């Protein structure tokens, strides 16, 4: 059975976030899918540093 891992982090814009998601889905189809899944998350930038 698969074990979930959650790589994925800050990008620039929403289009870039969708492109990142499609890229990780492309990276799943090759080689393993029955041991590891590695779904990905995202979040966009903010001006204030401490908020980031």
């Amino acid at each position: 059975d698969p074990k979930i891992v959650n790589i994925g982090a800050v990008l620039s814009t929403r289009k870039h976030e969708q492109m990142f998601r499609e890229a990780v889905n492309q990276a799943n189809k090759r080689h393993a899918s029955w041991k590891i899944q590695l779904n990905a998350t995202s979040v966009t930038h903010k001006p204030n540093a401490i908020q980031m």
């Epitope: 059975d1 889905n25 799943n28 189809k29 899918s33 029955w34």
Partner: antibody
Framework: QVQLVQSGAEAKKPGESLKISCKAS????????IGWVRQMPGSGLEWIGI????????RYSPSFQGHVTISADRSTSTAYLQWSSLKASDTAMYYC????????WGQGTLVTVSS | EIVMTQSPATLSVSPGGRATLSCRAS??????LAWYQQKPGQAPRLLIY???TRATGIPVRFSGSGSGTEFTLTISSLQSEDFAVYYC???????????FGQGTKVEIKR
């Protein structure tokens, strides 16, 4: 929790074309290499096809290349299988895989073509 | 394009012995393999993938070994519930090949 309930059994007269439905549940349908496997009465196994149900990228087996009509709906998670013709002497039983190591299997669906 | 040879054709053991089967490799098929159990009138299951790792929910008796040359599993202390047909199958260039075998068969002794 994964279930791969197939369609009920059916037999047909020679010549016609048939459809087989392998419904899925419990997981994101558009992430795993669904396939099919054959079994003749009192014999071994053979591989039919496989279809990554994200972009319908199929890769048929050379044994039945260009003879079957594998496909996969994205909405209801019901990757089908359709016949064209010449299905006369092919009485057997068919299963649907899950993930290219066959972690989960379905049930019994028998196809019998006779006069 | 590779033919899997499965031997022996039909074994037989007493309820409490052991077993030792064989999937002869016509080539050096990397280190990828599988081993399937199937009882009459039922859908097979998964036992070992990669020839060395156990799938979750499989009792501890089943184990195997192999390095791309006639890998082998040994069911130790075969109980009553076991003894149905077996199968071996490889996966090296996927998706291209998906070649199965013929598999042995185990029957109780009396």
């Amino acid at each position: 929790q994964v279930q791969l309930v197939q369609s009920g059994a059916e037999a047909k007269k020679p010549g016609e074309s048939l459809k087989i439905s392998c419904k899925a549940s419990g997981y994101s349908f558009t992430t795993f290499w669904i396939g099919w496997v054959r079994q003749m009465p009192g014999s071994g196994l053979e591989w039919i096809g496989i279809i990554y149900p994200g972009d319908s990228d199929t890769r048929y087996s050379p044994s039945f290349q260009g003879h079957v009509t594998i496909s996969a709906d994205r909405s209801t998670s019901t990757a089908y299988l359709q016949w064209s013709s010449l299905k006369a002497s092919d009485t057997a039983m068919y299963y649907c895989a899950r993930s290219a190591v066959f972690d989960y299997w379905g049930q019994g669906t028998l196809v019998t073509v006779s006069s | 394009e590779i033919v899997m040879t499965q031997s022996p054709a039909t074994l037989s053991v007493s309820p409490g012995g052991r077993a030792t089967l064989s999937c002869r490799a016509s080539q050096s098929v990397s280190s990828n393999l599988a081993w399937y159990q199937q009882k009459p009138g039922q859908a097979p299951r998964l036992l070992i993938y990669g020839a060395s790792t156990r799938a979750t929910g499989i009792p501890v008796r089943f184990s195997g070994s192999g390095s791309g040359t006639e890998f082998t599993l040994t069911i130790s202390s075969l109980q009553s519930e076991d003894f149905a047909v077996y199968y071996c199958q490889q996966y090296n260039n996927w998706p291209t090949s998906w070649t199965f075998g013929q598999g042995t068969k185990v029957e109780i002794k009396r």
